[PDB]
Amino acid sequence: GSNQNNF
Ligand SMILES: [Zn+2]
């Protein structure tokens, strides 16, 4: 899967 982190 793809992953995204929005801090
Ligand atoms: Zn993955």
Residue 2 CA to ligand 1 centre (angstroms): 5
- Written as six digits, the tokens of 3 are 């992953």
Expressed in Å, this structure's resolution amounts to 1.1
Residue 5 CA to ligand 1 centre (angstroms): 13
Residue 6 CA to ligand 1 centre (angstroms): 17
Residue for token pair 């793809």: 2
The DSSP output letter for 2 is -
Cα distance between residue 4 and residue 2, in whole Å: 7
Residue type, 2: S
Approach to solving? electron diffraction
Furthest CA-CA distance within the chain: 20
